[PDB]
Amino acid sequence: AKSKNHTAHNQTRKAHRNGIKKPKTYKYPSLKGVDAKFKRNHRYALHGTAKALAKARAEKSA
Amino acid sequence: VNVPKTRKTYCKGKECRKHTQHKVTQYKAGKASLFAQGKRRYDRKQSGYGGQTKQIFHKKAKTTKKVVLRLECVVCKTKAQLPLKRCKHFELGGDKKQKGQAL
Amino acid sequence: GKSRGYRSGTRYAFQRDFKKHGAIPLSTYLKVYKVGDIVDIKANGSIQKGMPHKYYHGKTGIVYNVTKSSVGVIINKVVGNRYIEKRVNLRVEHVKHSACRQEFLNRVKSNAAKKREAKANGETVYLKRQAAKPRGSRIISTEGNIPQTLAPVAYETFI
Amino acid sequence: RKVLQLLRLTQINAGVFVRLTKATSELIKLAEPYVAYGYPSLSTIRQLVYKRGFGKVNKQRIALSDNAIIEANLGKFNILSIEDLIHEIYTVGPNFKQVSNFLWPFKLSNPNGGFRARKFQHFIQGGDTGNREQFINALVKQMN
Amino acid sequence: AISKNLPLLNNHFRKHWQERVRVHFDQAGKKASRRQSRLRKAAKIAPRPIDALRPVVRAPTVKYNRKVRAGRGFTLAELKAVGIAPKYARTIGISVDHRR
Amino acid sequence: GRDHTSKQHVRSGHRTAPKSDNVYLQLLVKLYSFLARRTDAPFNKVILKSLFLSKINRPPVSVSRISRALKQKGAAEKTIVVVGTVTDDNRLLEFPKATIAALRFTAGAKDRILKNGGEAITLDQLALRAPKGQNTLIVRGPRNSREAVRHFGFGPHKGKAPRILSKGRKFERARGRRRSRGFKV
RNA sequence: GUCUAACGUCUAUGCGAGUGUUUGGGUGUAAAACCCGUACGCGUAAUGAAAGUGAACGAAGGUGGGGGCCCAUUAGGGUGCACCAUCGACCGAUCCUGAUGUGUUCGGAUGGAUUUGAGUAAGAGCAUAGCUGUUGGGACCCGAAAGAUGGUGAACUAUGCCUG
RNA sequence: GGCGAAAGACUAAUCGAACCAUCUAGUAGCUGGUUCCUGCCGAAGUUUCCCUCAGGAUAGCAGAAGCUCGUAUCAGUUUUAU
RNA sequence: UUGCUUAAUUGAACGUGGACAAUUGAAUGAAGAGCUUUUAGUGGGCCAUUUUUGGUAAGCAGAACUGGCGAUGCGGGAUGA
RNA sequence: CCUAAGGGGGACUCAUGGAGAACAGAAAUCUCCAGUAGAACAAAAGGGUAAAAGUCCCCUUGAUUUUGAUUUUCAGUGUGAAUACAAACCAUGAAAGUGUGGCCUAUCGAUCCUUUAGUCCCUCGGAAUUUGAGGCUAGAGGUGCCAGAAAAGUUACCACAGGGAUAACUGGCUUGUGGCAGUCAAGCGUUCAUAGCGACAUUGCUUUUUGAUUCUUCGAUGUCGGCUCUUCCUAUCAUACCGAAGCAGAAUUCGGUAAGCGUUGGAUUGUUCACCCACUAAUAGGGAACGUGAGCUGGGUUUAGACCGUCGUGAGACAGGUUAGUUU
RNA sequence: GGUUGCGGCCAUAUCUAGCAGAAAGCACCGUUCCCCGUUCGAUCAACCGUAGUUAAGCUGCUAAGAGCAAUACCGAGUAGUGUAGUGGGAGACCAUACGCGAAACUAUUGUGCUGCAAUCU
Ligand SMILES: CC(=O)O[C@@H]1[C@@H](O)[C@H](O[C@H]2[C@H](OC(=O)[C@H]3CC[C@@H]4[C@H](C3)O[C@@]3(C[C@H](OC(=O)/C=C/c5ccccc5)[C@H](C)CO3)[C@]43CO3)O[C@H](C)[C@@H](O)[C@@H]2OC(C)=O)O[C@H](C)[C@H]1O
Ligand SMILES: [Mg+2]
Ligand SMILES: [Mg+2]
Ligand SMILES: [Mg+2]
Ligand SMILES: [Mg+2]
Ligand SMILES: [Mg+2]
Ligand SMILES: [Mg+2]
Ligand SMILES: [Mg+2]
Ligand SMILES: [Mg+2]
Ligand SMILES: [Mg+2]
Ligand SMILES: [Mg+2]
Ligand SMILES: [Mg+2]
Ligand SMILES: [Mg+2]
Ligand SMILES: [Mg+2]
Ligand SMILES: [Mg+2]
Ligand SMILES: [Mg+2]
Ligand SMILES: [Mg+2]
Ligand SMILES: [Mg+2]
Ligand SMILES: [Mg+2]
Ligand SMILES: [Mg+2]
Ligand SMILES: [Mg+2]
Ligand SMILES: [Mg+2]
Ligand SMILES: [Mg+2]
């Protein structure tokens, strides 16, 4: 029979009708793939930071 | 391929949890039981009329097999299995290479 | 037979520079990478572990993870009609800090310094950059520079 | 095509004012084979703004028929009259961007007298595209 | 044959199903005829009740232990306790179950 | 001819009226079309848009959501506004005295609001005591809790719910859901 | 391009942590309309192959936004539902540790783990209807060469016989 | 099945497997056809897998329903730095 | 703040508090940005300029980018996707 | 393919050249100097490597365990392969470190079934014990058409759905091939390049060859040749008028204008082609859907019968021979 | 400023041939009982600093030096190229317009700079 093998013609036309969109940026990136040892300890540091701020505000209030 | 008959690898046995000495043996597939459910189902399906009821493989392509090492711990008798790459030639505890010798 | 392996077509991309083969200068191993740093990626052919794929040779990205000998860099790659976030683990031999950050970071300092100085003097200063503008009027002196008349030259063969 | 769209030139015989720097010069260089441009005189600017001057008001093309429209849209930029707008365009002022973007692209007619025999070649080579400089005034006189 | 993100179905319609389709057009007709039969039975045996007295029994299984329902007949021990013979009880509107 | 930089003749893509033909919902739209057009109060423009929403875009608000919203600091005497149905919650231990304006109240919800000293009024009654929505607090129900959303965006390593009719060990658990059966996605 | 069984999305409607009268019973001006209720289906708990176990550290969590609302007085502050990004907590599976104790092999407290679930984290569903899309059905309409089952032909003709 | 001095010949104008009725509306990735108007939008013949190469699934292109918001921060473009 | 890290009172990450106010840090444009669900047809292509492979070449076969025809009428090329 | 050709550490430095030493020479072994790698690193090639990744030596099993994340192909699915870490357990080294197979880029494999290892855990559903069986996790047994049916032929007795998505005519592009024609002039031609020729090269034309392609036609354009008949081309065989000669005459050869006019009868062959005989002024070459089958004929080719040779186990095949075979 | 130890950049530092080098340092240098390694105390190991030397190393200077580095009214706005035309040419290819723009060549200049610690005429 024999047919067309390959062509990238018209593909940049289709990608640019609704795409070619840069990804959105967020303040906090996901920590997926970050070192487990750092991630394990970072859990304890954030929890303690919240406690200190909670107590400081609990002092202000009453 | 030449593999020594002993090896010190990690032992998964609950008693050991460490590298111990192991005895290397080539794994040999066990005998097919007649009361395995798949062999029980196969015999019933083949019975009666209908001919051969399940496919028979023909188009062999592999020319080798994967060698599996049976590692038995000398301390607790726990066995372990290790597959090797595809080798045509394989001896266990053969003569070690002698480098520097003449022809 | 088609060939499409990992390092196909990287004959010249992954080559060392001429008269620059061999051992790695140790400033490469003394640099410090922090999460959020912008780094250029350039595969070193002499270090094959932690080596980037040929796509990332010449790309610049953000460090997101720091390990014993490597950094994780986030790259945005076009896949069809959108970008996909790629997370590549690279040994620091294939990584160098991007020189773009600092120009920004010096221009930030200069703007801050200029603003306070105008604030100190009680005047105003404009900090937005401008493209090159058309030049103003000017007067050309001809003392020692009387115009010399040129003409197109005839055709000659020099072989 | 993108360059012509970003210059708001999305039809034939559409005209726009551009302040010459480097970014906009390299833009016009990209669109050069499809446009005729030049340096407009004060009378040319006045005639353009008076006859075909329109403003973008709530994304609508509104005729500049009264100075109140101009004041209501450009008084925060110190433009209170059609002559303030013309001055801001001609002597390129601090608010050229806002005043020229407020101006709807001029929709000119074809030249009275035609173009040259073949438009789509540089003005230097006997065509119409590229920079004609002071002859942009004659061309606009033909087309406006 | 398989397309899109859809649930995988089990529609058992590969036999000659259309030859065995029972449509209950006669639901109302059977309701009416059942009522007429019930009237005939009542007028046949009046003033004797149309329903035999049934016992109350616990439902089997761990799921219906809590529930209690109408049984089939009173046991021989139960009829013995009230001094009624089963042969006589069946003739005075009492249901008997020799099995329970 | 024009080189169009955007698609031509494009509808806004937002509802400008309810799809419902209920005449009484139209009366509410009648009232808040006038209010949104004339008060400059952002509350009235939000309510008019919310009256257009479809049923899945106005999820029911439990009487527990109102209790938690009234438990914000300085919000105990605010008027709770729900453009939709307010349902009961038999998991609450107690309910405060509150004024709530809603499209509909369930029997348990109306009972509970009135049992605790509160009011259960309609959205037209709101427009007279608060024509600008003063001292109000709009409460919306959970949109992503719907069952249909479980199957949205299903794919490999996406963690969504497969569209399946039966649940059990024999239903889509072997190959592609288990490393012992090839791979897992 | 239909009808039907079972379905996905969306929409309208009724009720709502419930929902669905119609299998059936009552009733009737009699296949209608009207009325009734036990069960049952789906939902309200998941997870594990299973034995089994089974959802609050906290105001049902923190951070950055967030329409609307409150206090202001450009600006600013407070409160911030839905929703988004991110870091956590709880339940089930997997792995690690293994208290008082004990049918001495059971029990599994307590504390953890780049693991894992279609979960919890102040319910959202059920039912009816409509368009569109899916699958099984003759399946948009018409179409094979074939296969099977059960019957009818040696008035033509082939061959044997009998009689001319 | 018959019958054949054998041609795959003959077996009621039917023979390399008669005729009749049924299963049967047999199946068909292949042909053909597929019935009123206007308005708006508007493609693909490309990726991967498939006894896949005249076909499917899948992604892409397109329509419809919208939803959260209202200049927030986007771009088939330029400048500067790297 | 941490159970990570340092010889450490060193760092790492996440933070409390304070300072820098509209030239808040290039241009130009922006019928606004972002998000979701669902489904059709298609999955034979071909041509022109330029880059380009096999072939002596081909109105031949095959790729790259763009624009077109296909799906498209109108004026010109007499005629012509 | 490799128990090292994997891992660690240490020491040394290859290819090659020069100058020297008994047998010893181009090649044996020894010495010095030079030696950016011109070598070696299992195997293709590319990259990489010098107090090493190369050579040699010592010790080893990290070619181990639990599983997550990531890169390539990508639908951002699978498979293969690889990367950086987490938690163990080890090897090596004084140590820092390095090591999760081979310096890097290839070296491989789902569902169902079986088997082995692990956990010695769950279940066999009226309750137990022990066999047996079934589960959970990880390997192996294999799909090479390698995202993975279980599979020999023939039909010249043939059928169906289609296809000009595709071959066998004509036609279209091309012109390799075929045919024909030029230029430059070393040579030939007794002397003498061009009366007549003309090598090595090189420029073209033609579509009567054969290729190349597959655009049209597969709901069909009747596929060879001959007979009959018309017309057209010129690259002219003869006949008209002329120019040239290595033209004395006769004869002959080259050329110009020239297609007006003619170009045959037969043996053999189905032939187109060919070859012979003979006449003739000459017996030129071609086209017109390889002109011409509702004009014929039907010898050939190419249905079904049959024979032979070779092939095949056979049914049967032959672009091999042979004979009979409806031309509406 | 010299020198040593440890370095950063990794030839402006390399290569060849000469010459010079105060002080300290470095170095060669002397020995083999001990730890250690070799065919060989040559390398490696240890001891003495005692007997000697700047001969070598090292350092600096010299060379129309090689190489390397930098610069440019050098070549050259050349080659190439993005964009354009119903431009030229039978073609091969070429010219023009708006832009970007080399390499070789030629000439000149230079020949390590520097961080921490210690030490010295
Ligand atoms: C003997 C002969 O010539 O044929 C044998 C046949 O006897 C064998 O039948 C076995 C039969 O096989 C099956 O039922 C299939 C199960 C798995 C399928 C297939 C066989 O094997 C495959 C392919 C390949 O495994 C084999 O190939 C296995 C061969 C085998 C042989 C004996 C027993 C078990 C397996 C994959 C690894 C997966 O397993 C599979 C997925 O395609 O099972 C019975 C229980 C056995 O008793 C029976 O064995 C015998 C000797 O009778 O099937 C093989 C495919 C044939 O090659
Ligand atoms: Mg094909
Ligand atoms: Mg083709
Ligand atoms: Mg195709
Ligand atoms: Mg073991
Ligand atoms: Mg069975
Ligand atoms: Mg038998
Ligand atoms: Mg059978
Ligand atoms: Mg090959
Ligand atoms: Mg290749
Ligand atoms: Mg390179
Ligand atoms: Mg490796
Ligand atoms: Mg990588
Ligand atoms: Mg200022
Ligand atoms: Mg403008
Ligand atoms: Mg005129
Ligand atoms: Mg004119
Ligand atoms: Mg003119
Ligand atoms: Mg004129
Ligand atoms: Mg003109
Ligand atoms: Mg003209
Ligand atoms: Mg005019
Ligand atoms: Mg839910």
Ligand SMILES: [Mg+2]
């Ligand atoms: Mg009824």
Ligand SMILES: [Mg+2]
């Ligand atoms: Mg009736």
Ligand SMILES: [Mg+2]
């Ligand atoms: Mg119920």
Ligand SMILES: [Mg+2]
């Ligand atoms: Mg005890």
Ligand SMILES: [Mg+2]
């Ligand atoms: Mg005890």
Ligand SMILES: [Mg+2]
């Ligand atoms: Mg104990």
Ligand SMILES: [Mg+2]
């Ligand atoms: Mg206990």
Ligand SMILES: [Mg+2]
């Ligand atoms: Mg989870």
Ligand SMILES: [Mg+2]
């Ligand atoms: Mg929840």
Ligand SMILES: [Mg+2]
């Ligand atoms: Mg919930």
Ligand SMILES: [Mg+2]
């Ligand atoms: Mg049909």
Ligand SMILES: [Mg+2]
């Ligand atoms: Mg159908």
Ligand SMILES: [Mg+2]
């Ligand atoms: Mg259907």
Ligand SMILES: [Mg+2]
């Ligand atoms: Mg049919």
Ligand SMILES: [Mg+2]
């Ligand atoms: Mg059959």
Ligand SMILES: [Mg+2]
């Ligand atoms: Mg007869």
